[PDB]
Amino acid sequence: MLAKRIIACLDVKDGRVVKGTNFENLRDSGDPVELGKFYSEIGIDELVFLDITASVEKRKTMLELVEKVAEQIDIPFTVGGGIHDFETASELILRGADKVSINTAAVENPSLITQIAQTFGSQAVVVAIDAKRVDGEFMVFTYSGKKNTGILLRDWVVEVEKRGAGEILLTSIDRDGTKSGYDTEMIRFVRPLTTLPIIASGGAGKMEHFLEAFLAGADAALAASVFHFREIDVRELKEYLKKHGVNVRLE
């Protein structure tokens, strides 16, 4: 549908939620599987798990996470963090993930988008784009924000859709980590350039920020610590959005 989605992002490392949560009701407030299940039960529409485990155990660790998450939830989930090639993406989808997120590897080899899409469908391929204003232009950054690629956001969005991606996870480096709001200027910039769903990421601090993101043209809104630390309640968020005319899924 044209229903707007609320997505929780769980940063994970060695099978734990990085920085934990304030959910004292859980058996283990830092267990990403139990946390993901909890979120599915309280109204989150999809999950994104981003792993930062050391290379040696990373492959096994991501596969174990996917297997364990898949048995507990029925809502869509994406896995990402250091997916560099088709075989890695393939194993993760087969083990249970609905989608994979790719970022630096896609920029370095855009054919990777097409390669994954040809087997798993475009809907399986989320391209995460991290962008920042530099000298008055929106530029694409790789390596967790460390590298200005010199590629314009405008050009890369178009290329990503051409290559067969299914969704764009758009993170503003200028808002990420803050609580001042989503980068609606950046969302509005991207919206006319692509037909793909856009997941807004970075800057959420209060319920109103979600409304603003949707008005800007996002199809989904992603957040992490605002949910994990109970600054925003998911059901209350959905109530609020529905009240103000946004098409959310609200049972």
How far is residue 13's CA from residue 1's CA, in Å, rounded to a whole number? 34
Residue the block writes with tokens 């174990």:
64
**Dihedral sign of CA atoms 37, 38, 39, 41 in order:** positive
Residues constituting the chain:
251
The residues near 146 (Cβ < 8 Å, ≥ 6 apart) are none
**Which of 234, 80, 250, 71 has the alpha carbon at shortest distance from 171?**
80
Give first-to-last CA distance, the chain, whole Å.
15
Within 13 A of 18's CA, how many CA atoms are on the CB side?
Answer: 12
Provide the token pair at 174. 């200028």
Residue the block writes with tokens 């959420």:
204
**Which of 164, 185, 56 has the alpha carbon at shortest distance from 113?**
164
Residue the block writes with tokens 């800057």:
203
CB atoms within 10 A of CB 49: 25
- CATH code (residue 11): 3.20.20.70
For residue 21, CA distances in Å to 1, 71, 100, 169 come to 31, 22, 24, 23
Note every long-range contact of 141-150, with CB atoms under 8 Å and residues 24 or more positions apart, other chains counting.
141/173, 142/103, 142/104, 142/107, 142/108, 143/104, 145/173, 149/107
Question: Is residue 177 within 8 Å of 204, Cβ to Cβ?
Answer: no
How far is residue 171's CA from residue 186's CA, in Å, rounded to a whole number? 9
**Which of 94, 71, 186, 177 has the alpha carbon at shortest distance from 140?**
186
Task: Write out the E strands in 14-166.
Answer: 16-17, 46-51, 77-80, 99-102, 125-134, 137-142, 147-152
Write out the residue range of the structural domain in which residue 186 sits: 1-251
How far is residue 12's CA from residue 49's CA, in Å, rounded to a whole number? 7
Provide the token pair at 58. 């990373």
Number of domains in the chain: 1
At position 113, the amino acid (one-letter code) is: I
99 DSSP assignment: E
How far is residue 74's CA from residue 242's CA, in Å, rounded to a whole number? 23
Return the active site residues: 11, 130
How far is residue 77's CA from residue 189's CA, in Å, rounded to a whole number? 27
Experimental approach was X-ray
